Design brief:
Blueprint (H helix, E strand, L loop, with lengths): L3 H13 L8 E9 L10 E4 L12 H15 L4 E7 L5 H16 L4 E8 L3 H13 L6 E8 L13 E4 L3 E5 L5 H4 L8 E7 L1 H19 L7 E5 L9 H5 L10 E9 L36 H5 L2 H11 L4 E6 L14 H12 L3 E6 L14 H15 L2 H11 E5 L19 E5 L3 E5 L9 E8 L1 H19 L5 E2 L4 E2 L1
Parallel strand pairs: 3-4, 4-5, 11-12, 12-13
Antiparallel strand pairs: 1-8, 1-10, 2-8, 3-6, 5-9, 6-7, 7-8, 10-16, 11-14, 13-17, 14-15, 15-16, 17-18
Helix pairs in contact: 1-9, 2-3, 9-10, 10-11, 11-12
The structure holds phosphite ion (PO3).
Length: about 500
């Protein structure tokens, strides 16, 4: 096969969540990573994109991100579909949305627009702020704005960050539309989105229809949903299905698996699934006896959260090397378990077989864009899982030290930004074999939210990701490594 990694992930997803194929996960062909002619790698919407500079003077990443948001929205002829984590978009993120909507209206288009946020009077206020800023362009727009929480007890709400236009173009990734953390700051958060076009943008629209179908059903339950619309417009549960072609047009030759999760409180199980997993013998992940652990000890949760299995399968598909860039691998316990046991087992299995693993996380000095005190909380866990498969602790340490790079993130030679604040990173990135990668909103640390992302198999694109993000990251981050097989570092 030309696509061994997607083939493996797809086989796992059809066993885990067959009933959700099409809507919460979907494999498509014929996509394109949507870069410019001048800089074909700039489908990779990293921010701030100021490598080497502790003052972050020339934010080529941020500039491209905002321009691409505006460009995509400005090309809308039918629909604009946005999801994010509250607060609602502000600053130049909001400016980009308003500019794009005005541009589409001026080209003569009438648009349907949905903006959904997850949260713990705000929607009506955002709607009114937006309508005011649109001026006469607002007459051409049917707007739905909503904030939602799907489970209070399981801390579940939307965490996806998606911008889909006409079901044809999609931007998604880790970037929340928060000006103070990303933009108006001399210590900007480092993160990444991707831009694509093609059938996979349709997959995102079907995912958002899934969320809005739940949201509209629960729109009168104040504890769950706060909803606001323009004029006398109703809630639009199936805007994508109703407005865009079921199969989006092809734009390229890139194969993609879209995958998300429904968290807790939308759907309890995929009734079509006959998935029956081997539970790992925990470990020390559940800090307290009373916590219900959806990550490690809830088969039904897996079936409505295919993204967890997809990311573990992506790791399992690697033949040579795996790079992981995250805010964290571990969560704060309580209320979440500290780590995903199956994920750490999958990483251990790969290191035991000589596949190299790089993990870069956000500096614990951020703890907050960090949930650990020390990198030892990651290496100790990996070592302990390795011990189960290498015969003991000494052999585990040897395997780990021979095959691991573990570090905290920097983007320049300085240990912190020039303003004295630590670097914060927020990527949700996994790449394998310079071939296949995930960019999306799903953190690898335990989390029970609605999330979404893309797994792309394209060595060309993967090589661009290496040159533009992963290689510069390791250039500056390697100085903090506690383990680095390539330099014989083993602490
Ligand atoms: P996310 O926006 O919490 O990772």
């Amino acid at each position: 096969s030309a696509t061994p990694h997607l083939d493996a992930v797809e086989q796992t997803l059809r066993q885990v969540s067959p009933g959700l194929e099409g809507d919460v996960w979907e494999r498509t062909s014929g996509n394109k990573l949507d870069g410019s002619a001048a800089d074909p790698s700039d489908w990779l919407l990293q921010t701030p994109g100021c490598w080497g500079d502790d003052k972050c003077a020339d934010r080529v990443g941020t500039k491209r991100l905002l321009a691409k948001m505006t460009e995509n929205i400005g090309n809308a002829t039918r629909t604009v579909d946005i999801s994010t984590l509250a607060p609602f978009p502000n600053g130049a993120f909001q400016d980009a949305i308003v500019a794009g909507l005005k541009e589409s209206a001026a080209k003569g288009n009438k648009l349907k627009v949905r903006i959904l946020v997850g949260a713990a009077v705000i929607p009506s206020k955002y709607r009114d702020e937006l309508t005011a800023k649109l001026g006469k362009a607002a007459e051409n727009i049917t707007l739905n704005v909503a904030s939602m929480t799907t489970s209070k007890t399981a801390f579940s709400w939307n965490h996806s960050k998606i911008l889909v236009v006409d079901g044809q173009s999609a931007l998604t990734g880790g970037i929340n539309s928060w000006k103070d953390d990303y933009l108006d700051t001399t210590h900007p958060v480092s993160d990444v989105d991707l831009a694509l076009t093609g059938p996979a943008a349709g997959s995102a629209g079907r995912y958002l229809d899934t969320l809005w179908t739940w949201t509209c059903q629960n729109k009168s339950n104040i504890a769950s949903v706060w909803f606001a619309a323009s004029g006398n417009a109703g809630c639009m549960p199936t805007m994508h299905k109703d407005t865009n072609p079921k199969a989006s047009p092809a734009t390229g030759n890139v194969p993609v698996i879209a995958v998300g999760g429904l968290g807790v409180g939308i759907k309890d199980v995929d009734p079509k699934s006959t998935f029956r997993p081997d539970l790992p013998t925990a470990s020390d992940t559940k800090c307290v006896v009373g916590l219900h652990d959806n990550t490690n000890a809830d088969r039904d949760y897996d079936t409505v959260n295919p993204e967890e299995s997809a990311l573990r399968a992506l790791v399992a598909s690697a033949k040579g090397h795996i790079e992981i860039s995250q805010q964290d691998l571990n969560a704060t316990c309580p209320p979440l378990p500290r780590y995903d046991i199956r994920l750490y087992d999958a990483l251990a299995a790969k290191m035991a077989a000589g596949v190299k693993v790089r993990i870069v996380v956000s500096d614990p000095a951020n703890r907050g864009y960090s949930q650990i005190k020390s990198l030892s909380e990651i290496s100790d866990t990996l070592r302990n899982r390795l011990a189960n498969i290498t015969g003991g602790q000494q052999a585990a340490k040897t395997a780990m030290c021979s095959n691991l790079q573990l570090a905290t993130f920097r983007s320049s030679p300085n240990g912190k930004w020039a303003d004295g604040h630590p670097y914060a990173q927020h990527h949700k990135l996994v790449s394998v074999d310079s071939s296949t990668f995930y960019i999306g909103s799903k953190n690898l640390y335990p989390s029970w939210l609605q999330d979404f992302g893309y797994i792309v198999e394209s060595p060309e694109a993967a090589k661009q990701l290496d040159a533009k993000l992963l290689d510069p990251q390791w250039k500056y981050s390697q100085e903090t490594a506690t383990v680095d097989y390539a330099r014989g570092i083993c602490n």
